[PDB]
Design a protein around this ligand. Structure first.
Ligand SMILES: NS(=O)(=O)c1cccc2cnccc12
Lengths: 338, 19
């Protein structure tokens, strides 16, 4: 019942910001641009130093013309409107946002520990207690997001950053959407798509719980439950309704994953009468103190190396691209609310 | 092994979202 009351106040705070979003809270020359931390189809994320405070931030830069060509206008508006309104310990904080003639900018907290992706690939796989620690944070985050009628739709290790306390920060809200009914957009990452997305059905927040199953599997096995050289081959595996588990998976882990990687929506955990509690009370989580996880009181399985402020040694190197801003405003009407 | 198959595959790097 206290979770219920906690979520009620969270929704009151969210809706205030959802209905009156922050806008134009900094400008580009408030920052020095240091180094690219990551890229994507839209767009790139740069380490920046805020001149007036000396704080470092991670600045996502989107080219408005590219956003238009990729038909991501509404998604980009979703991303910023949602990110500026949410507030949860495991969600990266949006500190500033603004736009200029050419680009959109979202300035987020810099999370120096690197992507979970990097650590997972290097180490091979996480122990089940390690994976469970991370998984518990995603469970709580989706409980929070779903209570706000938000679907996240892009869970993967690439989007989970490890902070200096060893806890997760979720990044990349590019496909997040506030929706009370079903929705239909084919989006996500191939390995993580639920069957109902691939099959062009209307779908709902249950796709995030499927994606959680993929994430737990990949953390504990070191590889995804459905992988191939091409996405079409991955989709055929996803919709087949068959999953194979490594022999070192515990019985409890396999049982949890069978209920998350469940094609049948009337049986998939997270989606049933008991909601998230079917997950929180599962035997695999028996050792998890959910309040202590939320409070960040649990000892983390590992603390990323910290070589100082502004150091990026936990991130890959990327080819550096200039930030060109045209003398003419592009796509002004499309992004007027950004 | 399944691990060896994954490691030899073309999708062990960062995965892009579908658009
Ligand atoms: N992984 S990343 O470089 O794309 C990224 C995106 C958004 C926020 C971030 C925050 N700190 C580090 C990297 C960040």
């Amino acid at each position: 019942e206290s979770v219920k009351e906690f979520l009620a106040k969270a929704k009151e705070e969210f809706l205030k910001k959802w209905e009156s979003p922050s806008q134009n809270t900094a400008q580009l020359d408030h920052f020095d641009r240091i180094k690219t931390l990551g890229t994507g189809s839209f767009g790139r994320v740069m380490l920046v130093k805020h001149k007036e405070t000396g704080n470092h931030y991670a600045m996502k830069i989107l080219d408005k013309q590219k956003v238009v060509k990729l038909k991501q206008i509404e998604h980009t508006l979703n991303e910023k409107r949602i990110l500026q309104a949410v507030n949860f310990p495991f969600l990266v904080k949006l500190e500033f946002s603004f736009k200029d003639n050419s680009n959109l900018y979202m300035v987020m907290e810099y999370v120096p520990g690197g992507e979970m992706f990097s650590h997972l690939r290097r180490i091979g796989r996480f122990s089940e207690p390690h994976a469970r620690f991370y998984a518990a944070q995603i469970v709580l985050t989706f409980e929070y997001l779903h209570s706000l009628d938000l679907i996240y739709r892009d869970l993967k290790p690439e989007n989970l950053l490890i902070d200096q306390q060893g806890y997760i920060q979720v990044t990349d809200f590019g496909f997040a959407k506030r929706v009370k009914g079903r929705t239909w957009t084919l989006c996500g990452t191939p390995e993580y798509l639920a069957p109902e997305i691939i099959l062009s059905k209307g779908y709902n927040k249950a796709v995030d719980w499927w994606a959680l199953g993929v994430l737990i599997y990949e953390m504990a096995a070191g590889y995804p439950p459905f992988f191939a050289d091409q996405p079409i081959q991955i989709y055929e595996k996803i919709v087949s309704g068959k999953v194979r588990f490594p022999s070192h998976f515990s019985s409890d882990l396999k049982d949890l994953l069978r209920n998350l990687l469940q094609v049948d929506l009337t049986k998939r955990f997270g989606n049933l009468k008991n909601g998230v509690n079917d997950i929180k009370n599962h035997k695999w989580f028996a050792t998890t103190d959910w309040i202590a996880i939320y409070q960040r009181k649990v000892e983390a399985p590992f603390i990323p190396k910290f070589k100082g402020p502004g150091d990026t040694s936990n991130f890959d190197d990327y080819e550096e691209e200039e930030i060109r801003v045209s003398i003419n405003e592009k796509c002004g009407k499309e992004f007027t609310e950004f | 092994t399944t691990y060896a198959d994954f490691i030899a595959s073309g999708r062990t790097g960062r995965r892009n979202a579908i658009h």
